[PDB]
Design an enzyme around this catalytic site. Sequence first.
Site, mmCIF file in Angstrom:
data_model
loop_
_atom_site.group_PDB
_atom_site.id
_atom_site.type_symbol
_atom_site.label_atom_id
_atom_site.label_comp_id
_atom_site.label_asym_id
_atom_site.label_seq_id
_atom_site.Cartn_x
_atom_site.Cartn_y
_atom_site.Cartn_z
ATOM 1 N N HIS A 62 43.160 20.040 69.913
ATOM 2 C CA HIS A 62 41.909 20.174 70.593
ATOM 3 C C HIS A 62 40.779 19.010 70.097
ATOM 4 C CE1 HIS A 62 43.254 24.209 71.271
ATOM 5 N NE2 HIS A 62 43.477 24.301 70.381
ATOM 6 N N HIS A 92 35.448 16.159 62.275
ATOM 7 C CA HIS A 92 36.165 16.151 63.627
ATOM 8 C C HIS A 92 35.119 15.479 64.591
ATOM 9 C CE1 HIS A 92 34.661 20.247 63.951
ATOM 10 N NE2 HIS A 92 34.606 19.865 65.031
ATOM 11 N N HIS A 94 34.025 15.397 68.907
ATOM 12 C CA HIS A 94 33.709 15.918 70.314
ATOM 13 C C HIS A 94 33.587 14.758 71.287
ATOM 14 C CE1 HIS A 94 33.960 20.286 69.222
ATOM 15 N NE2 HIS A 94 33.320 19.716 67.982
ATOM 16 N N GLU A 104 28.087 18.012 72.230
ATOM 17 C CA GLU A 104 28.009 19.237 72.338
ATOM 18 C C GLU A 104 26.449 19.682 72.496
ATOM 19 O OE1 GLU A 104 30.974 21.130 69.554
ATOM 20 O OE2 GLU A 104 31.629 21.356 71.444
ATOM 21 N N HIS A 117 31.086 16.413 63.787
ATOM 22 C CA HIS A 117 30.694 17.476 62.884
ATOM 23 C C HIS A 117 31.094 17.486 61.679
ATOM 24 C CE1 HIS A 117 30.354 19.776 66.897
ATOM 25 N NE2 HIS A 117 29.225 19.256 66.603
ATOM 26 N N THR A 196 31.829 26.166 67.512
ATOM 27 C CA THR A 196 31.826 25.731 68.865
ATOM 28 C C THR A 196 33.212 26.004 69.598
ATOM 29 O OG1 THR A 196 32.112 23.583 68.603
ATOM 30 C CG2 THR A 196 29.728 24.293 68.771
HETATM 31 O O1 LIG Z 1 35.675 22.585 66.425
HETATM 32 C C1 LIG Z 1 34.713 22.860 65.635
HETATM 33 N N1 LIG Z 1 33.109 22.570 65.817
HETATM 34 S S1 LIG Z 1 32.386 23.263 64.366
HETATM 35 O O2 LIG Z 1 31.782 22.200 63.536
HETATM 36 O O3 LIG Z 1 31.565 24.297 65.053
HETATM 37 C C2 LIG Z 1 33.824 23.878 63.627
HETATM 38 C C3 LIG Z 1 33.522 24.782 62.475
HETATM 39 C C4 LIG Z 1 34.973 25.018 61.959
HETATM 40 C C5 LIG Z 1 36.248 24.874 62.723
HETATM 41 C C6 LIG Z 1 36.398 24.285 63.970
HETATM 42 C C7 LIG Z 1 35.037 23.922 64.338
HETATM 43 ZN ZN LIG Z 2 32.834 20.548 66.181
#
Ligand SMILES: O=C1NS(=O)(=O)c2ccccc21
Ligand SMILES: [Zn+2]
EC number: 4.2.1.1
Length: 258
Positions: A62, A92, A94, A104, A117, A196
Site C-alpha cells: 500500500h 511512509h 502517500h 491526503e 507521515h 488514514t
Molecule cells: O497509512 C497510514 N497513514 S497514518 O499516518 O495515518 C498511519 C498510522 C499507522 C499505520 C498506518 C498509517
Molecule cells: Zn499515512
Amino acid sequence: HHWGYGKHNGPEHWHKDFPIAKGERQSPVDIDTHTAKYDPSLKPLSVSYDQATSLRILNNGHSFQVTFDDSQDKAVLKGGPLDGTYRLLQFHFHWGSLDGQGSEHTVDKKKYAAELHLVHWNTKYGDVGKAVQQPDGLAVLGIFLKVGSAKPGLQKVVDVLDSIKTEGKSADFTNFDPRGLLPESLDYWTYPGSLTTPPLAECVTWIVLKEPISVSSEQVLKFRKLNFNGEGEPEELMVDNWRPAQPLKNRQIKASFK
Ligand SMILES: O=C1NS(=O)(=O)c2ccccc21
Ligand SMILES: [Zn+2]
C-alpha cells in the site's frame, strides 16, 4: 476482497469491512485556513531525532515504510498539543499519479504531490498495539511535498526503491536521519483524527506542518515506479494511494501560528 486503492476495493468500499470509516473523527480532512482557530495556549513542538535508529525499508503493498527501533526513547516527539512522550515508529508516504494530487490532507482544497507521515506512539501505553486502542495513542506528523527543487535528505530513500519494487520486499536501511525530511518551520495545525488506512482507528492526534518540503520531479517519479503487486503478478503501478478528505463533523482545527 482485501482493501486497496482501486475501483473495486478503494476508499469508498472500506466501510464494509471497517465500519468506523463512517465515524466521527476520521482523517484526512480539508484544513480551511480561515476557519482554523489560533490557540496561543499551544506549545512549540519538540522533535528529538538525533539518536534515531532506522532498521528496515519495506514495500507493504500500500506504500513503502521505513521502520525505527522504538524499544527506548531514542527518537521522540513531545510538546505541541501532546501530553507525554511519543516514540517514532515508522514513516511512509502517500502520493499521486500526477503532481496536482497525492496528499491526503488538503489546505483550502489545494492538494499537494505527496504527503509524508511520521508515526509516533504514546509510551504510557507500553506498546503500539495498545496505543491504537486509545484516543490519544498515536501522534502523526504530516508534511506536504511540492515539486520543485530536490531534497537532498530524501535521496538515500529514492535510491533504494529499486530494491523493494514489489509487495513484501524489504531491505536493510540503517543510519538514515529523518531530520533531513523536515521543513524549516515547525508551525502547525492540529486536530483529533484517525489512521488514514484500515483499520481506520480513531487514535491519532494529527500535527500537520504548514510549510511544505520541496522534492524534484525525478525524486517523485521514482515513487511512481513502485508496484502494488507482488513479484510475478501483473504489474500495477503504486500511485494514488491516498484517501480523500472526510467530513470534519464536530471538530475544530487549531493553528499554532497567526
Ligand atoms: O497509512 C497510514 N497513514 S497514518 O499516518 O495515518 C498511519 C498510522 C499507522 C499505520 C498506518 C498509517
Ligand atoms: Zn499515512
